[PDB]
Amino acid sequence: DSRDYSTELSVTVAVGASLLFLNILAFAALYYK
Amino acid sequence: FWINKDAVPARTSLGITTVLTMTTLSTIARKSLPKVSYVTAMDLFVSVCFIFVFSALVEYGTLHYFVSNRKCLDGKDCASFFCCFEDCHIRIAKMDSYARIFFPTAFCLFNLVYWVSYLYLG
Amino acid sequence: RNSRAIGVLWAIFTICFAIINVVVFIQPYWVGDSVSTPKPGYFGLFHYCVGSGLAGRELTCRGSFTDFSTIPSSAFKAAAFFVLLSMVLILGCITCFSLFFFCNTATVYKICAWMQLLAALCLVLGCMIFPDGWDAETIRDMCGAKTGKYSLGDCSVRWAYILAIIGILNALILSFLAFVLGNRQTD
Amino acid sequence: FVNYIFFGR
Amino acid sequence: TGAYPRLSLSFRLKRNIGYFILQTYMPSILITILSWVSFWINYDASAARV
Ligand SMILES: *[C@@H]1O[C@H](CO)[C@@H](O[C@@H]2O[C@H](CO)[C@@H](O[C@@H]3O[C@H](CO[C@H]4O[C@H](CO[C@H]5O[C@H](CO)[C@@H](O)[C@H](O)[C@@H]5O)[C@@H](O)[C@H](O[C@H]5O[C@H](CO)[C@@H](O)[C@H](O)[C@@H]5O)[C@@H]4O)[C@@H](O)[C@H](O[C@H]4O[C@H](CO)[C@@H](O)[C@H](O)[C@@H]4O)[C@@H]3O)[C@H](O)[C@H]2NC(C)=O)[C@H](O)[C@H]1NC(C)=O
Ligand SMILES: CCCCCCCC/C=C/CCCCCCCC(=O)O[C@H](COC(=O)CCCCCCCCCCCCCCC)COP(=O)(O)OC[C@@H](O)CO
Ligand SMILES: CC(C)CCC[C@@H](C)[C@H]1CC[C@H]2[C@@H]3CC=C4C[C@@H](O)CC[C@]4(C)[C@H]3CC[C@]12C
């Protein structure tokens, strides 16, 4: 493995951004429909 | 919580006896170790259980006291959107009604988190 | 349609948020060391694993929140304490999901709007206090003297810290969502 | 249980 | 009989007050606050307070 952490950061950022986009989509569907 | 509000000696006996039982359980659980000066998993579990029973006891005490001895912003208004105050007595008499599901589900959540924390990552 | 589905979605995602919050709390992998490392190993809020590097890079893992004496610095103590407060608060809402069936819906939506905001504030404060801890002898030894107060030095950020940052942002968005759900659904 | 249903609610 | 040599190796031991905090002091304290609950209970409930 050595010191390769870039993949972990990439996948974590990807899933975090996906969840954040889902929450923002729900909020957008709520506050102005 | 399922006993009537007017059964004061019974509910008081239940609470006080449960806290004594927690203290006794804590002592007999911790006497199976050396006299180490840090907490363990069993001590933490016993502490949380003691907190739960003490919360139930003080809940009944509060109920008895309040029942017996006493009577810019896109949003149009800033306080309602980002605060709250409409009287929040209102439903203090209802405390035993919804306290029958608050405590068990709180305990279930604590047990889930505790066991998942130790049995896998430790 | 709107309420009966959006509430279930918010509840499910709040459960997911609490799950990731506890996961980032108990996960040791927070601050690792890159190839330019005096010594190998990773670092956590209260669990540091320093690779000895003798023959098979065996790690002398040591530390636990159950004893503050093992924690290197008081900044880590404060960070773990406030993460614990945030996790207590979010678990307070997942406890309160049963309370909907008895009390008024909008006010309890506002209750977790506020207490989600406090959970977010606690997580924020812990996350900004966490950099303060990179000054103890352990961090200065394994990650090099270049590490300092609010100075990464030769250390590298692992998935847990960025996970906590997106958890902060997610907590803020969830609090706002609870606020608007409580306020608008009354009308 | 009996105290709940026959003396309380 | 006479004068004799002596060496002395002395240690100072400080007791770690963590076990008694979580076995003696804190249970007794919490028992005291719980005993204070009798004041809040109504006066006529003699059985419960006693
Ligand atoms: C735990 O509890 C224990 C028990 O209570 C406690 O022990 C006491 O600790 C103190 C030290 O902190 C001890 O006191 C010291 O004793 C030293 C020895 O002094 C005697 O011997 C002298 C002879 O000199 C030769 O001694 C040996 C060989 O025998 C060797 O080092 C050399 O060859 C050396 O030349 C002797 O001179 C001295 O005489 C006493 O009487 C004369 C008068 O007749 C008087 O003038 C002296 O002052 C003295 O009272 C004695 O018989 C001693 O050197 C040492 O001196 C300190 O003070 C001088 C300045 O005055 C400094 O220059 C020196 O560096 C020291 O700081 C000191 O007196 C004491 O004896 C222990 N208790 C007992 C009962 O033995 C522990 O400390 C406690 N705590 C912990 C955690 O350990
Ligand atoms: C949902 C609710 C969630 C609540 C969850 C609560 C979380 C509970 C953990 C707290 C912090 C634990 C880590 C820090 C304290 C424990 C670690 C510790 O050592 O603390 C000592 C004193 O304090 C201690 O003993 C312990 C101090 C903290 C105790 C907190 C009590 C928790 C509630 C008790 C319930 C009452 C009933 C319990 C009794 C039956 C220090 O001294 P000392 O120099 O000698 O050591 C020097 C060394 O060389 C030897 O230890
Ligand atoms: C029902 C709700 C209110 C309970 C919320 C608090 C619970 C989940 C908290 C309180 C004390 C916490 C524990 C405190 C210390 C440690 C040691 C650490 O090395 C791993 C996590 C672990 C084991 C924690 C797990 C979560 C815990 C049990």
Q: Are A26 and C9 in contact (CB under 8 A)?
A: yes
Note every long-range contact of C33-36, with CB atoms under 8 Å and residues 24 or more positions apart, other chains counting. C33/A3, C33/C142, C33/C143, C33/C154, C33/C155, C33/C156, C34/A3, C34/A5, C34/C154, C34/C155, C34/C156, C35/A2, C35/A3, C36/C154
Q: How far is the CA of B107 from the centre of ligand 3 (A)?
A: 13
Q: Which ligand gives the minimal distance to the CA of E14? A: 2
The contacts of residue B4 (CB under 8 Å, 6+ apart) are D3, D4, D7, D8
The one-letter amino acid at B119? L
> CA nearest B66: which of B94, B102, B85?
B94
Is the CA virtual torsion C168, C169, C171, C176 positive or negative? Answer: positive
Contact by Cβ (8 Å): C120, C171: yes
- With beta carbons less than 8 A apart as the criterion, state whether B34 and B96 touch: no
Ligand 2 atom 47: the closest Cα is on which residue?
Answer: E16
C chain contacts of residue B52, beta-carbon cutoff 8 Å: none
Residue entry with tokens 């006993």: B3
Resolution of the coordinates in A?
Answer: 2.9
C-B interface (Cβ pairs under 8 Å ≥ 3): yes
- Judge contact between B82 and B73, C-beta under 8 A: yes
CA of E22 to the centre of ligand 2 (A): 7
Ligand in closest contact with the CA of B113: 3
Say if the Cβ atoms of B2 and D1 lie within 8 Å.
yes
Chains A and D touch (3+ CB pairs under 8 A): no
Asked if C164 and C123 touch (Cβ cutoff 8 Å), the reply is: yes
Tokens coding B97: 């009604």
User: Residue B3 — left, alpha, or beta (φ > 0 → left; ψ -120 to 50 → alpha)?
Assistant: beta
C172 close to A21: Cβ distance less than 8 angstroms: no
Kindly state the DSSP code that residue E21 receives in the 8-state scheme: I
Which residue's CA is minimally distant from atom 15 of ligand 2? Answer: C67
Q: What is the DSSP string of chain C?
A: -HHHHHHHHHHHHHHHHHHHHHHHHH---SEEE-SS-SS-EEB-SS-BEEB--SSS--B--B--TT-GGGSS-HHHHHHHHHHHHHHHHHHHHHHHGGGGGTS-HHHHHHHHHHHHHHHHHHHHHHHHHGGGGTTSHHHHHHS-TT-BTTB-TTEEE-HHHHHHHHHHHHHHHHHHHHHHHHHHHH-
Residue count (chain E): 50
CA-nearest residue to D2 within chain B is: B3
Two structure tokens written together for A1:
């493995």
Residue E15 phi, psi dihedral angles, 5° rounding: -70, 135
Chain E residues within 8 A of B35 when measuring between CB atoms: 19
> How far, in Å, is the centroid of ligand 1 from the Cα of B53?
59
Closest CA to C114 of C183, C185, C179, C166: C179
Integer Cα distance of B22 and E37 in angstroms: 18
E36 vs B contacts (CB less than 8 Å): none
Experimental method of this PDB entry: cryo-EM
Known binding residues of E for histamine are: 1
Chains in touch with B (3+ beta-carbon pairs under 8 Å) read C, D, E
| Beta carbons of C43 and C76 less than 8 angstroms apart | no
Question: Binding site for 4-aminobutanoate: what residues of E are annotated?
Answer: 1
What is the residue type of A23?
A: N
| Ligand 1 binding residues, C-beta < 6 A | E 8, 10, 12
Nearest ligand to residue C48 Cα: 3
Residue B78 CA to residue B76 CA, distance in Å, equals 7
Which residues of chain B neighbour D8 with C-beta distances below 8 Å? 2-5
Give the whole-angstrom CA distance, residue B11 versus residue B17.
Answer: 10
